[PDB]
Design a protein around this motif. Structure first.
Motif, PDB file in Angstrom:
ATOM      1  N   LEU A 100       0.833  -1.200   0.000  1.00 47.28           N
ATOM      2  CA  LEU A 100       0.000   0.000   0.000  1.00 47.28           C
ATOM      3  C   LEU A 100       0.866   1.249   0.000  1.00 47.28           C
ATOM      4  N   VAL A 101       2.018   1.149   0.659  1.00 41.13           N
ATOM      5  CA  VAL A 101       2.961   2.260   0.752  1.00 41.13           C
ATOM      6  C   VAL A 101       3.623   2.511  -0.593  1.00 41.13           C
ATOM      7  N   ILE A 102       3.977   1.423  -1.272  1.00 35.17           N
ATOM      8  CA  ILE A 102       4.623   1.496  -2.579  1.00 35.17           C
ATOM      9  C   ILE A 102       3.738   2.233  -3.570  1.00 35.17           C
ATOM     10  N   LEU A 103       2.542   1.691  -3.788  1.00 36.84           N
ATOM     11  CA  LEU A 103       1.576   2.278  -4.711  1.00 36.84           C
ATOM     12  C   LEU A 103       1.503   3.784  -4.519  1.00 36.84           C
ATOM     13  N   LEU A 104       1.362   4.197  -3.263  1.00 38.74           N
ATOM     14  CA  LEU A 104       1.277   5.611  -2.912  1.00 38.74           C
ATOM     15  C   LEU A 104       2.584   6.319  -3.230  1.00 38.74           C
ATOM     16  N   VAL A 108       5.017   5.241  -5.404  1.00 41.01           N
ATOM     17  CA  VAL A 108       5.208   5.214  -6.851  1.00 41.01           C
ATOM     18  C   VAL A 108       4.091   5.971  -7.550  1.00 41.01           C
ATOM     19  N   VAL A 109       2.915   5.961  -6.929  1.00 41.94           N
ATOM     20  CA  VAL A 109       1.741   6.641  -7.470  1.00 41.94           C
ATOM     21  C   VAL A 109       1.728   8.100  -7.042  1.00 41.94           C
ATOM     22  N   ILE A 155       7.948  17.434  -0.925  1.00 40.56           N
ATOM     23  CA  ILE A 155       8.286  17.038   0.439  1.00 40.56           C
ATOM     24  C   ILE A 155       7.381  15.908   0.904  1.00 40.56           C
ATOM     25  N   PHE A 156       6.101  16.018   0.561  1.00 41.01           N
ATOM     26  CA  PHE A 156       5.105  15.018   0.930  1.00 41.01           C
ATOM     27  C   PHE A 156       5.424  13.683   0.277  1.00 41.01           C
ATOM     28  N   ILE A 157       5.798  13.742  -0.998  1.00 46.71           N
ATOM     29  CA  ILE A 157       6.138  12.548  -1.768  1.00 46.71           C
ATOM     30  C   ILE A 157       7.436  11.942  -1.262  1.00 46.71           C
ATOM     31  N   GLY A 158       8.443  12.794  -1.096  1.00 46.51           N
ATOM     32  CA  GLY A 158       9.755  12.368  -0.617  1.00 46.51           C
ATOM     33  C   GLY A 158       9.660  11.855   0.811  1.00 46.51           C
TER      34      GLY A 158
END
Length: 44
Positions: free
Chosen positions: A1-5, A7-8, A27-30
């Motif tokens: 679930l963390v990956i998808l988010l 990578v997504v 910053i949120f993505i990183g």
């Protein structure tokens, strides 16, 4: 679930913000991403 988010989420920042680093979105993505990684490292 963390990956998808991750990578997504990241894909959106680079393909969602048309920017390299979002002082607000980036910053949120990183930061958010790292969370997903660590979660798998220190956990799973």
């Amino acid at each position: 679930l963390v990956i998808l988010l991750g990578v997504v989420g990241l894909s959106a920042l680079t393909g969602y913000l048309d920017y390299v680093l979002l002082p607000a979105l980036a910053i949120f993505i990183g930061l958010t991403i790292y969370a997903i990684q660590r979660k798998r490292q220190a956990d799973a």
